[PDB]
Each structure stands twice: as structure tokens, then as C-alpha cells.
Amino acid sequence: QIVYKPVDLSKVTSKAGSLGNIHHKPGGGQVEVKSEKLDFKDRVQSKIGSLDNITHVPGGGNKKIETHKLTF
Amino acid sequence: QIVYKPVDLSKVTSKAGSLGNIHHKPGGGQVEVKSEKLDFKDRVQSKIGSLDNITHVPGGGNKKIETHKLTF
Amino acid sequence: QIVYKPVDLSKVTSKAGSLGNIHHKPGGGQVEVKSEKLDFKDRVQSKIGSLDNITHVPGGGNKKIETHKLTF
Amino acid sequence: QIVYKPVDLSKVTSKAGSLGNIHHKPGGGQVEVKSEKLDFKDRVQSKIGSLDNITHVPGGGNKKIETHKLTF
Amino acid sequence: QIVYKPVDLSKVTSKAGSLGNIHHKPGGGQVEVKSEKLDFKDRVQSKIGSLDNITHVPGGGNKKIETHKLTF
Amino acid sequence: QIVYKPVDLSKVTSKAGSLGNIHHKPGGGQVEVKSEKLDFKDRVQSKIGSLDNITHVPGGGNKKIETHKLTF
């Protein structure tokens, strides 16, 4: 007899891994740029005048990773 | 006799991995740009004058990854 | 007789690994840039004039990793 | 003999008291206000939540004022 | 014989009392206000939450004032 | 014989009392205010939470004032 019974009888409850509200509220801002003879070759990545706001939220939560084997 | 019975009887309840409200409210802004003789030749990525707001929310939740094997 | 029975009878409850509200509130700002003869040749990564705010939240939570094996 | 000859032979030339260009360029902005039980009774002047930009240029120009009399 | 000859043979030239360009460029901003039970009774002047920019230029120009009299 | 000849042969030239360009460029800012039971009774002048920028330029220009009299 070969018998294989992985259960995972599990509970994740009552606000266990939440985030709150997400508010992104920029207060305006000002930018001015003057550029003349500028010259770019192979694979240049350039950002000359910037006023930049990022809210990035890949997180929170109840991440579970599991693996089983049984091998002959 | 070969018998395989993985169960996964599991419970994720009551705001367990929720997000709140998502609010993005940019307060306007101002940008001015002057460019004269510029020249770009190969794979150039450029951003000269910018006022930029990004809200990115790929997260939250209860991500579960599970794998089972049985081999001869 | 070969018998495999991993259980994982677990409980994660009541704000166990939650984050509060996420507020990103930039207070405006000011940027000015003047560029004359600049020249970039190979794989150059450049950021000349910037006022930059990043809120990055990939963390928080109840991360669990587990692995089981049985081999002959 | 009574005689009265006030002349004023005067010259005001070539940008003598001029202004340049006037530019008013607000970069946006953000305001939030919550008021519950407030009460005002007599000649009250109030400004609770404000984001305000004033450009006031009451000068410039060629205003001339002159008055003449001769009395017995 | 009574005679009165005030001349004022005067010259005001070539940018003599000029102002340059006037630029007012607010870079945005952020304000938040919460008020519960406040009470004002007589001639009260109040400014609770403010982000305020004033550009006031009452000068410049060619203002001339003159007065003449002759009395018996 | 009675005579009165004030001449005023005067010259004011070539940037003699000029001002340059006037630039007012606020760099944003942030204000937060919380008020519970405050109470003001008579002629109160109040400023609780403020971020204030004033550019006041009352000079410059060619202001001339003159007065002449002759009395018996």
C-alpha cells in the first residue's frame, strides 16, 4: 500500500494581513527646462528635468509557498 | 494499492488580506520646456520635461502556491 | 505500507501582520534646468535635475515557506 | 502789470520708468478642510483653509497732477 | 510789475528708474485643517491654516505732483 | 518789481535708480492644523498655522513733488 494524504486544514481570518486605505495626493509643483545642442548615442537612458511621484504597493498579504514529494 | 488524497480544506475570511479605498488626487501642476538642436541616434530613451504621478497597486491578497508529486 | 500525512493545522488571526493606511502627500516643489553642449556615448544612465518622491511598500504580511521530501 | 507763465517743458523718454513683462504662474496645489460646530457673532473676519497667490502691481504709468491759482 | 516764471526744463531718460520683468511662480503646496468647537465674538480677525504668497510692487512709473499759487 | 524764476534744469539718465528683474519662486511647502475648543473675545488678531512668503518692493520709479507760493 502507498497512501498520500496532505491536509492543509488552515485559517487566516479577521483582518489578518490587510493594508489600510492608499491615498496618493500630490500638491502640484513646477518644472522649467532649456536644452540646446545635446546629443545621445547607443543605449542612453536620460531624464533631464523631472518632478516625479511614485506610489508602488505590490505588498501586504498572507503569502504561503509549499512543496511536497514522495519518490522511488 | 496506490491512493492519492490531497485535501486543502481551508478558510480565508473577514477582511483577511483586503485593501482599503485607493485614492489618487493630483493637485494640478506646471511644466515649461524649450529644446533647440537635440539629436538621438540608437536605443535612446529620453524624458526631457515631466511632472508625473504614478499609483501602482498590483499587491494585496492571499497568494498561495502549492505543488504535489509522487513518482516511480 | 508507505503513508504520508503532512497536516499544517495553523491559524493566523486578528491584525497579525497588517499595515495601517498608506498616505503619500507631496508638498509641491520647484525645478529649473539649463543644458548647453552635453553628449553621452554608451549605456549612460543619467538624471540631471530631479525632485523625486517614491513610496514603495512590497513588505508587511505573514510570509510562510515550507518543503517536504521522502526519497528511496 | 500782473503776469503768470508756469512752463513745464519736460521730457521723459526711452523706457524711463517702465515695467518688464508681468508673469503670474501658479503650480497648482492642494487644500482639505473639516469644520464641525464653529460660531461667529460680530464683525468677525475669518479665513480657515487657504492656498492663495496675489500679484499686485499698482505702480507704473505716467501720472501727472498739477494745480494753478491767482487770487485777490 | 509782478511776474512769475517757474520753468521745470527737465529730462528723465534711458531706463532711468525702470523695473525689470516681474515673475511670480508658486511651486504648488499642501494644506490640511480640522476645527471642532471654535467661537469668535467681536472684531476678531483670524487666519487658521494658510499657505500664502504675495508679490506687491507699488513702485515704478513717473509720478509727478506740482502746485503753484500767487495771492493778495 | 517782483520776480520769481525757479528753473530746475535737471537730468536723470542711464539706469540711474533702476531695479533688476523681480522673481518670487516659492518651493512649495506643507501645513497641518488641528483646533478643538479655542475662543476669542475682542479685537483679537490671530494667525495659527501659516507658511507665508511676502515680496514687497515699494521703491524704484521717478517720483517728483514740488510746491511754489508767493503771498502779500
Author numbering:
A (entry chain A), B (entry chain B), C (entry chain C), D (entry chain E), E (entry chain D), F (entry chain F): 307 to 378
The publication says:
The assembly of tau into amyloid filaments is a hallmark of Alzheimer's disease (AD) and other tauopathies. Cryo‐EM revealed the existence of disease‐specific tau folds, which are challenging to replicate in vitro. We studied three full‐length recombinant 0N3R tau forms (the wild‐type and the C322A and C322S variants) using an RT‐QuIC assay with brain homogenate seeding.
C322A tau formed filaments resembling AD paired helical filaments (PHFs) but with a more open C‐shaped core. C322S tau yielded structurally distinct filaments with an ordered C‐terminal region. Both mutants seeded further aggregation, whereas the wild‐type showed poor reproducibility and mainly unfolded aggregates.
